[PDB]
Ligand binder design. Sequence first.
Ligand SMILES: CCCCn1c(Cc2ccc(OC)cc2)nc2c(N)ncnc21
Length: 208
Amino acid sequence: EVETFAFQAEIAQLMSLIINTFYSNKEIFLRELISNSSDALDKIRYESLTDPSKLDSGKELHINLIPNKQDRTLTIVDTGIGMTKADLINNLGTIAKSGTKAFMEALQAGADISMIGQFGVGFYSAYLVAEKVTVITKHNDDEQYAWESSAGGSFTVRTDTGEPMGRGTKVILHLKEDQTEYLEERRIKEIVKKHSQFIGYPITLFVE
Ligand SMILES: CCCCn1c(Cc2ccc(OC)cc2)nc2c(N)ncnc21
């Protein structure tokens, strides 16, 4: 069963701003997602120092970037802490309300969209480049879920029946038709080197 939910109002407004504003420097979406992955990997690492069993679901702490030209997707995979059902449905949105208001406010005093990560809502930047985002995630204390949204004010969540992932998150960007440059190996390498070159986990850029 697929459950459908309405985003809190501030998040829907943020998403529409990201989709509608003219802003050419879209490449920043990638470092925002890699930074979120990096924090997640930090978190499971720090938690394992006191409970080694938290890594029974996978010891390797890493990030993979996988382009797929056939599906027109770019997927950012991590083996971080992952997200629970309550994170997806409710708590991340709850946390996101304050950062949204602040970011929207800064967007005058003249900030620009690239500064979105300074407000803790950098995930939404995915919508600079993707028409649909699917997030598959598995946290130690919960089941594997799929979250999905094409924006428009709503999102779905369901138990994922796909291939089990151990622990972590996969953010799958279904790219807009004019954003396929982010499938190209040279373009992804250039962005990673420019914006994400000292992430303290191995980043593997898969090739097609
Ligand atoms: C607010 C940060 C934490 C949420 N989060 C994020 C940000 C976020 C926020 C809202 C979302 O809505 C579904 C999805 C991800 N990415 C993460 C990741 N790769 N692993 C673990 N947690 C992640």
